[PDB]
Design a protein around this ligand. Structure first.
Ligand code: NA
Ligand code: NA
Ligand code: NA
Ligand code: NA
Length: 462
């Protein structure tokens, strides 16, 4: 993706978007009990911790575009992945408005907590001023959609989240680019059934893990992924995507039965208009990170990409023996023969992607079930039930998380969430975690599940 045009918002009649510039993240009561190095991301230019220019840093992800046509390798990659999806009988019929907004099986209700986007944010109008869970009212919404229409600017916010020392210093904060409510709803109507099919079928047919529950899904992955693992990392995947990858996505959507008109929404993602504070800008390429379907579309594109690279480097490849699951940029894949990921990564560079084998800069030279991660988690087969696989979030990441809070009123929910991750590290690890939590008075005021209970509930869930 490439920023094509930027100017002061006022020159175009847009008011300044008044976004949060101070973090909601504060040190929790566990800040001193546990060790950590992470701190809230930089949210504003004047942050004293900056060792770089902030505005340049946050937009540095837009590395440019490769300007090329959909080539023979992409065409065959699209054909192959499209043939997999055809198995699922995805309906291209619009999802009815009530299902698309207030929840149906496979597609949770639209989040009332997130930004309603433009123009609502400039009018002080919130999602709850328009929608109502209790009523399932669509009257105000139909009104707003008629009045303001579709294809509105996306509002860019800086993500308020913990970051490493390096990322704070370099100012590499992430951006969330929020689709207008109108566009969110329209896209959920148009693609809602696709969304639903993907959510209900994580695995190697959708090639997707979006919506998965690692507690259950981790046991299925090694069954699905037969051979030698491939686990390339990307740097700045979303923003690196050039328009040709969006063209590939449109082709696959058309193969599934969507009309050219219904694929128009992909153009809204690719060639996008953003408002950031006092500025507005147009981007060519790049998946906006915060519109409807961004994770699913990112995953579909990753499925096309990896196939393309393998087809391009390994001319004798048999994609019918290839398996992959993606969650956005994150990929775990296998093939029955060793594949040189460094060759794939270099082929990727030719398509404007910045990729590195998972073993690069690590102490090992082969990706295995011992060292592979997916969704930040390791894989560890249970000692007693070897066919069951624990998703293993590093205790370090759990400790980083517990040391801060955006609101201490949620301490019980936050800490319980972390316990559900922590226990997979083993009974000893978990008991020490509990002890330290309980070493602050708040910790003894919390309902914390016992190790035996967590393990018993996990076993029974299968
Ligand atoms: Na874009
Ligand atoms: Na990964
Ligand atoms: Na390899
Ligand atoms: Na290495």
């Amino acid at each position: 993706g490439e920023i094509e045009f930027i100017e002061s918002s006022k020159d175009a009649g847009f008011p300044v978007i008044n976004t949060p510039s101070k973090t909601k993240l504060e040190p929790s009561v566990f800040h001193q009990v546990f060790e950590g190095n992470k701190e809230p991301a930089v949210l504003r230019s004047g942050d004293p911790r900056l060792k770089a220019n902030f505005e340049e840093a946050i937009f540095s992800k837009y590395i440019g575009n490769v300007n090329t046509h959909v080539d023979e390798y992409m065409l065959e990659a699209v054909d192959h992945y499209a043939g997999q999806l055809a198995t699922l009988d995805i309906s291209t019929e619009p999802m009815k408005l009530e299902d698309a907004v207030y929840g149906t099986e496979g597609l949770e209700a639209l989040d009332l907590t997130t930004s309603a986007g433009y123009p609502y944010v400039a009018l002080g109008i919130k999602k709850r001023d328009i929608l109502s869970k209790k009523t399932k009212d669509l009257t105000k919404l139909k009104e707003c959609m008629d009045k303001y229409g579709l294809n509105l600017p996306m509002v860019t916010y800086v993500k308020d989240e913990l970051r490493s020392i390096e990322k704070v210093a370099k100012g590499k904060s992430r951006l969330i680019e929020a689709s207008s409510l109108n566009d969110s709803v329209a896209m959920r109507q148009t693609f809602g059934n696709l969304y639903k099919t993907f959510h209900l079928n994580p695995g190697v047919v959708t090639g997707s893990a979006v919506g998965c529950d690692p507690d259950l899904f981790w046991s299925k992955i090694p069954v699905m992924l037969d051979g030698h693992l491939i686990a390339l990392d990307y740097s700045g995947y979303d923003a690196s995507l050039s328009p040709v990858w969006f063209a590939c996505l449109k082709m696959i959507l058309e193969k599934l039965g969507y009309t050219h008109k219904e694929t128009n929404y992909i153009d809204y993602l690719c060639n996008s208009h953003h408002l950031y504070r006092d500025k507005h800008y147009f981007v060519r390429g790049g998946m906006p990170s915060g519109c409807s379907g961004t994770s699913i579309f990112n995953s579909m594109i990753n499925n096309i990409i990896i196939r393309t690279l393998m087809l391009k480097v390994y001319k004798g490849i048999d994609l019918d023996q290839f398996r992959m699951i993606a969650y956005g940029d994150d990929v775990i894949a296998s093939y029955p023969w060793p594949i040189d990921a460094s060759l794939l990564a270099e082929a990727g560079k030719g398509y404007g992607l910045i990729m590195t084998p998972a073993d690069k800069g690590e102490c090992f030279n082969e990706v295995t079930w011992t060292n592979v991660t997916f969704l930040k988690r390791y894989f560890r087969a249970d000692e007693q039930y070897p066919f069951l696989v624990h998703p293993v979030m590093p205790m370090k990441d759990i400790h980083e998380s517990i040391r801060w809070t955006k609101d201490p009123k949620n301490t019980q929910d936050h800490v319980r969430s972390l316990c559900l991750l922590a226990w997979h590290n083993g009974e000893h690890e978990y008991e020490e975690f509990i002890r330290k939590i309980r070493s602050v008075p708040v910790g003894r005021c919390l309902t914390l599940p016992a190790f035996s209970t967590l393990r018993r509930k996990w076993l029974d869930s299968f």
